Amino acid sequence: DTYQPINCDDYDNLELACQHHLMLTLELKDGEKLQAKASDLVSRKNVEYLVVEAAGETRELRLDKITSFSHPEIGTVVVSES
Amino acid sequence: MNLTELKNTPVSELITLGENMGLENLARMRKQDIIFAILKQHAKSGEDIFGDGVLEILQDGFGFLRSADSSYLAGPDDIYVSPSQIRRFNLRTGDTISGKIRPPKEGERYFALLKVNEVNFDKPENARNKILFENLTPLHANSRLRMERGNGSTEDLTARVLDLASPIGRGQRGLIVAPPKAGKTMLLQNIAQSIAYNHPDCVLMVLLIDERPEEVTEMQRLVKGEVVASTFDEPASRHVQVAEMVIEKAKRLVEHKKDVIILLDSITRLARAYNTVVPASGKVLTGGVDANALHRPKRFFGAARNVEEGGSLTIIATALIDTGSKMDEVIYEEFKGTGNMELHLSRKIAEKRVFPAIDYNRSGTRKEELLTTQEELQKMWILRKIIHPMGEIDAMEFLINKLAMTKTNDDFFEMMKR
Amino acid sequence: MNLTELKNTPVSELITLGENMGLENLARMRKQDIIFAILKQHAKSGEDIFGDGVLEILQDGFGFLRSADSSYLAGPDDIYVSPSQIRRFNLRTGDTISGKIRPPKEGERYFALLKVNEVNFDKPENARNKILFENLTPLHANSRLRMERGNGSTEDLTARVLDLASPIGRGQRGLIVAPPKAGKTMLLQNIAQSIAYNHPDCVLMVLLIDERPEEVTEMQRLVKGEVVASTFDEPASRHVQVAEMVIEKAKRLVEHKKDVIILLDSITRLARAYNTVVPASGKVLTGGVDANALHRPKRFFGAARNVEEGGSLTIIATALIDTGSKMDEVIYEEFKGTGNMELHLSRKIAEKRVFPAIDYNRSGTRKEELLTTQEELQKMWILRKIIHPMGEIDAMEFLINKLAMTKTNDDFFEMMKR
Ligand SMILES: Nc1ncnc2c1ncn2[C@@H]1O[C@H](COP(=O)(O)OP(=O)(O)O)[C@@H](O)[C@H]1O
């Protein structure tokens, strides 16, 4: 329900990925993957959102829901809720 | 462990703590180096390490979390904040950030911020919606800061004379004009004690600029608040940096509807520091003072105001006169009409070893009707009529004896009235 | 929306408007930035945007419409005017322009004026052919400014005393000589409210140079009209910039057959500002002043005149004496009698907490017969004779008590005879 901001180190990597406009391998705890490109990081009603598109979908999802992200360039960093 | 608790422990205890953790050769290095070494050793265990400080955004866009214990001095133990973090929460210089930190990665130098917990002693969500300081409407001071403790001690005489001479209110822009060897340092200590005792809610910050090293330690022991100083050993750029950090930190607290009091010593040394730092514009006034060098100190001194929305900023600076330097004289000439409160110390009274050395006739306040009540104002008017003809030396001797016989000012008034 | 209506909105309300428009992070930024962000968001819809301001001509032919709300401070909200627009009309500095504006395009940072609707509160073509201010034929003062309200309150007598001491009309220079702590600010406020009440038709402009921030807000909320001020935080170049904008705007209104009044406080600080900013030509005079630098303040003061064609320009400057400085006297010595009307205030009379502190003996206006009817001249002449023997201190006590039970000046003159 209530949103919890992610750690600062995780946010910097995501912004680095968005700035370079590189491919992002979004992962969740369920086990689903979305190899898509993230455009930019935005905030809405004190909750930041990440807009990531694969073929023009440009879906917007919460940052705290994202569990893991990997790429050959940046390290395979998992997020921590605590 | 907590980073701020490490900076408060004495160096001898830090070494014993470091040595039993496996560290060696910690005795011969600086305290900031010891703290940085200890933090890295504790980071091996993977435990959470907390920290806090005041943000200072550099030109390149990244900032550091300096600590008030080191007087905002750059050191190895400063916490690095990425420019994205300043973007994520809109942070300005002077924000007090507290939260978890992480050890440096490969290729890094400083500890980095990991998770912001509080900003300006408040949640990050609320701290981002505070209106900027420049958008607040200044007002005249109307809530009075009473210096009189009322315990009847001899140290309370200086505070009581201060109320009679020049009342101080929240949001005042004070100026204490003092020659050398006039007891200026002991005057500020009485004010700091009176503020910390009568008004515990107000945030008290003491700023010493170009001060002797032994005077800094004495002030820190006495003053019950935050004391930040820059000794004369440090370069002129250091003096500017401390002043910038203090005024920006004060502004952020005022935006949260808090009363902030700044005791500055001295505005003359601060103005001289800016004169060295700023590039020469080609227009130099008498005494070697650059024309636009005084723009920066007046920004510092002009920030004192009573905010209509809530909170206030009180600045009580001291100006140096009769120092034998023409640079001091011209600097003082540019601050004469700036302040709304004026207190004059005289060397002649100090030469007779009668304290405080306040020149009662030349000291006063503007719009004092707002600070004092109707009956209180009339009594001060009656008293000022008596003190007006007599000379300055006799004015204090007459006033000290009358105040000594009583305990409070109202008792002094009724005794004087009869 | 209308820019001028948007600019007068409180900052707290402006943030709420931006939130409803989808903007974020509008807090913790200056009011000008908030206005600029909101306008761009609204212009994204495509609706028409109305804006107005006072034209300022740069050295490169650039035109900007500054705002009186921000005291003509350069900012993002300023409207850019192309040189082609200036060439189309008879546009110079100080020409008020109202019209529709457009959002900036690529390579542009300021909104651009698109369709100018009103210039100087009249048709744009009419203002394209007008007689320049210098070409207007000067003439002495014929009309008189009535500074009487008739309410008989405790504040009305101050207007009467200055009216009796020296009458003031329209189109002649005026000077007020005031020492520190002499009720100078209260005198200006009393004059300013009297002028607005008695003469709603005339345009009242109050100019404050190097003033404390708390005094500006008090003046704005009290004076009904236009109040433009620059605090001591701003650099010297800002002080002269404000002065130039006010006088040029005053001239244009005069050209359109309007009688404008400028209240200056103070010419000494304005003159000091010019000395700092004007480059040195190698000529150094006593007191650290330059003769060529002093040529500009006197031009500002010397522009006051009564136009035979119509309207007038009235300037009532203020001069500071015995402030303890050195160049202050030199500034005063350059304006000993350059003004048609002169009024003096004394520290001694103000010391006894009795106001006003007007010195009747020192005050005096030249060619006073052109202002009031001949029958009243004898009434003032006999008043001077009955007040000349006693001292200036006792003169004020005599005036106040005798006028305490008197309603207007006419009753006082009749009661004086009997
Ligand atoms: N309020 C006071 N009561 C008693 N003595 C005082 C007081 N203020 C100053 N003095 C005396 O004045 C001397 C020098 O004052 P100091 O604090 O050095 O002034 P400054 O810092 O301006 O040089 C001290 O030795 C102290 O004994």
Side-chain angles (χ1 to χ4, degrees), chain C residues 363-409:
Chain C
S363 65
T365 170
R366 311 299 87 184
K367 306 212 307 171
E368 187 269 348
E369 63 278 355
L370 286 80
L371 301 178
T372 331
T373 168
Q374 182 67 211
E375 58 90 10
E376 194 175 325
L377 265 53
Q378 288 77 208
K379 298 176 174 180
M380 272 84 74
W381 280 327
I382 63 180
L383 199 275
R384 198 211 71 82
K385 303 298 180 178
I386 203 180
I387 207 174
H388 187 15
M390 59 270 213
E392 60 281 353
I393 290 89
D394 300 326
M396 284 309 301
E397 282 96 57
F398 164 73
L399 284 175
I400 293 180
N401 57 50
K402 193 169 179 180
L403 287 163
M405 63 293 299
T406 313
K407 184 61 62 61
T408 62
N409 298 335

Side-chain angles (χ1 to χ4, degrees), chain C residues 145-292:
Chain C
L145 286 178
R146 184 56 54 183
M147 303 198 55
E148 305 292 330
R149 297 193 71 262
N151 59 333
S153 59
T154 64
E155 59 91 10
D156 196 11
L157 51 88
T158 308
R160 303 204 288 174
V161 174
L162 65 91
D163 190 16
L164 268 54
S166 298
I168 175 62
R170 303 185 185 186
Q172 68 274 60
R173 298 166 298 277
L175 195 66
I176 296 182
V177 185
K181 297 302 185 64
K184 170 188 67 66
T185 302
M186 294 175 57
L187 175 63
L188 270 303
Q189 297 179 359
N190 204 330
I191 293 181
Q193 59 188 358
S194 172
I195 292 182
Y197 177 78
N198 289 343
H199 310 75
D201 59 331
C202 71
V203 179
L204 170 64
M205 307 181 66
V206 182
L207 180 53
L208 308 173
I209 302 297
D210 198 308
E211 190 61 34
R212 294 177 292 275
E214 55 274 4
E215 302 294 331
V216 179
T217 63
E218 180 188 24
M219 201 71 173
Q220 291 179 341
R221 296 180 173 183
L222 208 157
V223 169
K224 175 60 64 180
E226 174 177 340
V227 180
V228 190
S230 69
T231 60
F232 60 95
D233 319 333
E234 285 88 330
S237 62
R238 177 87 179 109
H239 292 298
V240 299
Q241 161 189 344
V242 175
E244 301 291 338
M245 293 286 297
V246 172
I247 180 60
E248 295 300 325
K249 176 181 172 58
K251 294 176 180 177
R252 307 303 174 260
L253 298 183
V254 168
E255 296 176 354
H256 289 252
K257 310 302 178 301
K258 294 183 182 59
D259 41 352
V260 303
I261 303 180
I262 297 181
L263 305 181
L264 180 58
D265 196 337
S266 62
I267 187 58
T268 58
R269 312 219 63 83
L270 172 58
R272 178 192 306 270
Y274 271 113
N275 174 33
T276 300
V277 64
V278 162
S281 300
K283 177 58 182 179
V284 184
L285 293 84
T286 61
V289 301
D290 296 358
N292 49 13

Side-chain angles (χ1 to χ4, degrees), chain B residues 158 179-187 190 212 355-356:
Chain B
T158 306
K181 299 282 190 170
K184 173 200 62 171
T185 304
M186 295 199 57
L187 178 66
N190 294 327
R212 296 181 294 276
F355 294 91

Side-chain angles (χ1 to χ4, degrees), chain C residues 118-155:
Chain C
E118 292 281 324
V119 171
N120 289 317
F121 316 102
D122 64 281
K123 219 169 305 303
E125 44 271 44
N126 305 345
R128 200 180 304 106
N129 39 9
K130 278 295 183 300
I131 309 303
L132 296 322
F133 177 77
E134 56 279 10
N135 301 4
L136 299 172
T137 51
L139 196 141
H140 311 92
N142 310 338
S143 180
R144 190 184 190 275
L145 286 178
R146 184 56 54 183
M147 303 198 55
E148 305 292 330
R149 297 193 71 262
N151 59 333
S153 59
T154 64
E155 59 91 10

Side-chain angles (χ1 to χ4, degrees), chain A residues 8-57:
Chain A
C8 296
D9 54 354
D10 302 355
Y11 185 92
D12 297 338
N13 296 332
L14 268 37
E15 179 161 335
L16 179 62
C18 294
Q19 176 64 214
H20 292 3
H21 296 69
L22 44 85
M23 181 65 62
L24 199 274
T25 65
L26 185 145
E27 295 186 358
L28 257 280
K29 268 295 192 298
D30 55 12
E32 69 91 7
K33 283 80 182 178
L34 295 172
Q35 288 74 7
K37 298 178 181 178
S39 63
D40 196 2
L41 278 166
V42 297
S43 178
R44 212 62 54 89
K45 291 88 185 64
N46 295 329
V47 175
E48 51 270 8
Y49 289 99
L50 175 55
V51 276
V52 52
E53 61 280 351
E57 295 80 12

